[PDB]
Design a protein around this ligand. Structure first.
Ligand SMILES: Cc1cc(NC(=O)Nc2cnn(Cc3ccccc3)c2)no1
Lengths: 177, 179
């Protein structure tokens, strides 16, 4: 049965840990958001064919440019993440994440994921951005960034509402099969 | 209440880290050193390169660090001092990180499926590679937990600042030690 290593990368603002917990437990953690998600694996069926999906978090390593790539070798698919309500995280896809992932894993598929979809229409979030002369990241901005990096898919999700979340991981697996 | 969830997590995850290193040593390492099985010439007598100083990392956590973290369970606001006290022991993660690229290539180029057959036979969800990244993960995670304690503990909380300082310095020093 096919084994799949999926590494999740991106800025601290994406909520990587929260993404993975919400995905694996089928719920936003709400009460308390754990800082630790340990390397995880589970059998899922995609398009019939069952698969063993391995998920590794990278939260904590955002400042350690030489430690991050210790997790990269033999990855089958990367999720390069940014938060839809952080323009700086979206630009870091280009400035930080894509270059290192390419440098170490030139032929590994990338899914581009925008997290925090539920905040893109939230008044307070929008206003807080307006005060910095910014706006949330919209769909065509994601598509264009996806083309620029060679991403096989651009997907948007919320850990909070579950919207698009199960799809992210289905598609990670499809990008390997 | 928030400082309590963070301390609980610190502890639950410390226990799991100790259990994870123990499994790594007693399955993947033990099959190499035992003399129960045929070891590829590619890796023979090269367990020091594969596992780095993970034994010594494990002894620290399992002999000392987890018992001391437990003692701070009702003193979450003081736990930064635990890191200060044991700062020197964390220097072993510098050695471990330095070695890890050499470890990974050695397993790649020379172990073929030795460790995968061990994994299958023992029925482990985690591969040797999944276990061997854990020290890298754990040493970059303590600073996240301490930062979270800073957001919910008073100015009688430079018993977090100095801890966090140490736990930012260790991974940076490890990072800067890489080629
Ligand atoms: C990784 C990720 C997060 C996400 N969407 C969010 O986090 N949404 C969000 C953030 N804050 N709130 C209010 C809140 C916060 C904490 C506890 C209770 C209420 C709503 N989508 O992907």
């Amino acid at each position: 049965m096919q084994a799949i290593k999926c590494v999740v990368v991106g800025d601290g603002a994406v909520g990587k840990t929260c993404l993975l917990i919400s995905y694996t437990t089928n719920a936003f953690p709400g009460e308390y958001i754990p800082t630790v998600f340990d390397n995880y694996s589970a059998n899922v069926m995609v398009d019939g064919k069952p698969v063993n999906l391995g998920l590794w978090d990278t939260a904590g390593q955002e400042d350690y440019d030489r430690l991050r790539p210790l997790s990269y070798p033999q990855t089958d698919v990367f999720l390069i993440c940014f938060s839809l309500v952080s323009p700086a995280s979206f630009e870091n896809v280009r400035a930080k994440w894509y270059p290192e992932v390419r440098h170490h894993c030139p032929n590994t598929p990338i899914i581009l994921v925008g997290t925090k979809l539920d905040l893109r229409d939230d008044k307070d979030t929008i206003e807080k951005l307006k005060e910095k002369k910014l706006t949330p990241i919209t769909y065509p901005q994601g598509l264009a960034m996806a083309k620029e990096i060679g991403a096989v898919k651009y997907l948007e999700c919320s850990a909070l509402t579950q919207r698009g979340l199960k799809t992210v991981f289905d598609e990670a697996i499809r990008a390997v099969l | 209440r928030k400082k309590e969830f963070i301390m609980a997590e610190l502890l639950q995850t410390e226990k799991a880290y100790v259990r994870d290193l123990h499994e790594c040593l007693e399955t993947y390492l033990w099959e190499m050193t035992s003399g129960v099985e045929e070891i590829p010439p590619g890796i023979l007598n090269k367990e020091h390169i594969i596992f780095g100083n993970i034994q010594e990392i494990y002894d620290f956590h399992n002999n000392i660090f987890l018992k001391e973290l437990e003692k701070y369970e009702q003193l979450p606001e003081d736990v930064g001092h635990c890191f200060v006290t044991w700062a020197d022991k964390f220097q072993m993660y510098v050695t471990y990180c330095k070695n890890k690229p050499d470890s990974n290539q050695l397993i790649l180029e020379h172990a073929g499926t030795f460790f995968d057959e061990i994994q299958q036979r023992h029925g482990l969800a985690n591969s040797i590679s999944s276990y061997l990244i854990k020290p890298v993960q754990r040493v970059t995670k303590y600073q996240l937990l301490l930062k979270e304690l800073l957001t919910c503990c008073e100015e009688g909380k430079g018993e977090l600042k100095d801890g966090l300082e140490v736990m930012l310095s260790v991974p940076k020093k490890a990072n800067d030690a890489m080629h």
